[PDB]
Paper text:
Hexosaminidases are enzymes ubiquitous across all domains of life and play multiple roles in glycoconjugate metabolism as they remove nonreducing terminal N-acetylgalactosamine and N-acetylglucosamine residues from glycans, glycolipids, glycoproteins, and glycosaminoglycans. We have expressed one of these, HEX-2 from Trichuris suis, a porcine parasite, and shown that it prefers an aryl β-N-acetylgalactosaminide in vitro. Toward N-glycan substrates, it displays a preference for the removal of GalNAc residues from LacdiNAc motifs as well as the GlcNAc attached to the α1,3-linked core mannose. Therefore, a thorough phylogenetic analysis was performed and the GH20 subfamily 1 candidate enzyme from T. suis was expressed recombinantly, characterized, and successfully crystallized, yielding the first experimental structure of a eukaryotic subfamily 1 GH20 hexosaminidase.
In order to gain insight into the specificity of T. suis HEX-2, we solved its X-ray crystal structure at a resolution of 2.55 Å in a C2 space group. Overall, HEX-2 displays a modular structure with a N-terminal catalytic domain taking the shape of an (β/α)8 or TIM barrel followed by a C-terminal three helix bundle, whose function remains unknown. There is one protomer in the asymmetric unit. Analysis of the interfaces and assemblies with PDBePISA37 revealed one interface leading to the formation of a crystallographic dimer around the 2-fold axis. The structure also revealed the presence of a Zn2+ ion not far from the binding pocket. There is also a disordered surface loop between the Zn2+ site and the binding site which resulted in the lack of electron density between residues Glu199 and Arg220 so they could not be modeled. Additionally, the positioning of the Zn2+ ion implies a noncatalytic/structural role, potentially in the stabilization of this disordered loop upon substrate binding. As the enzymatic activity experiments indicated that T. suis HEX-2 removes GalNAc and GlcNAc residues from glycan substrates, its newly resolved catalytic domain was superimposed on that of S. pneumoniae GH20C, which has been cocrystallized with the GalNAc and GlcNAc reaction products, which are also surrogates for actual substrates. 265 residues out of 320 aligned with a rmsd of 1.9 Å and major differences are observed at the level of surface loops in particular those surrounding the active site pocket and in particular the −1 subsite. This structural analysis indicated that either monosaccharide is capable of effectively binding to the predicted −1 subsite, whereby the key contacts will be conserved with the 1-hydroxyl and 2-acetamido groups.
Numbering used by the authors: 54 to 199, 220 to 529
Amino acid sequence: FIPKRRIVHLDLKGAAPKPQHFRAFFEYFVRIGATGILIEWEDMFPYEGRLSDLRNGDAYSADDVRMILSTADQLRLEVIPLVQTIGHLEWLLKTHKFYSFRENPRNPQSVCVSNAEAVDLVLHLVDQVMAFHKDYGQFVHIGADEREDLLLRHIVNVSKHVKTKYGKNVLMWHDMIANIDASLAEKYDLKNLVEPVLWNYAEDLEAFLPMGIWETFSAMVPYMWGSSAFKGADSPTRYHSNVKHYLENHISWIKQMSTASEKFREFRGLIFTGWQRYDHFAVLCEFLPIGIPSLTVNMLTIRNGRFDASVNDQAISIMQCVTGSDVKGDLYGCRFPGSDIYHHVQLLHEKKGEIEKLLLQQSVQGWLSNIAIDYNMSSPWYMNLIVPDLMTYKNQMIELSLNIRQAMLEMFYENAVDEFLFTYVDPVINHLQRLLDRATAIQRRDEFPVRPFPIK
Ligand SMILES: [Zn+2]
């Protein structure tokens, strides 16, 4: 079983490329056998009217969006918009402006389904997007991911609005309905309204997925999609490439689809998720350039129906990496969009592992403790072995920061680089510097007090 639709998620909640660089990405997406993309604009769309105010400051122009979709179209890439319609609306409801619209007045996450002024804002939001996307895809994704009648009547509502006005098929995330009685699904004629997208980013799905989950859903709907991950599902603070993880998800998905393909009028395809933050408010996870290796190997793996040293190897020559090499281990001299940023961030991963190993060895542990730092009281001799290592790693991390800023600044907006550095690079420079200061001060002491000396 090979999914005929293979869709690459583009999550713009953060680290949203500058607009001239989508062509490159998209051409790469063709070159690995993607049929389409899923664009979650979040706050980066050129919103207008009442929504103009909840736009990212670095938001994309009308002329940009029109060029992005054209470029997609010309490269024979389908475009599915993702618009959140119930939850994950922090970007919209978190100012004063729509405070009134929230399910819970403290949480900027959900909108009150039962408040029709709010449902109205949602439908405008849909229409503002579909304005641009209408001429360019057969599908729309409405979210409804991470009393049941109010939910389903909200979905129904939204679905029909899209189906009717734009003649497209609605996809939503599965979690909202996996529980519900087959009965309620029929009551709301869901077999005719929505295509559930089942998502699971685990390595062994066989471990996490209930049994006859597929049997459950085929008894409810004719159309089903699946959703794997290439990035944004290791850890929230995952900033580097861990291909081994995503690859397990993809192998584990092949087996699943090869059992589920046949119980549906059509298993439509798989969406390769690529979260940029775990949520609006979370930190930046792995940048798209960092996810290219994962994404390359996992596309080829789903189209070849399994992973083998053949897959590995086409993968590499597509990335124009240096021959030999393993896609699961280190890669050198690759040439793909953002490949410099990859190179540099992967170095960051390595340097930081060294630095943590040094901060965990006997020297720093025993003689650069908190009492050493606060009471300038330790062995000069131990300093002489530490201070040199602190200074090297500190200076290397300073140069890494420069390089990454330069690399990332050709493709990303400042805030995104500033956020990355602030999160994943700078705290270490600061921490090395503060240790280097105290270890240097102790290295300069020659006279120490007899014990005991006051402590608190
Ligand atoms: Zn409510």
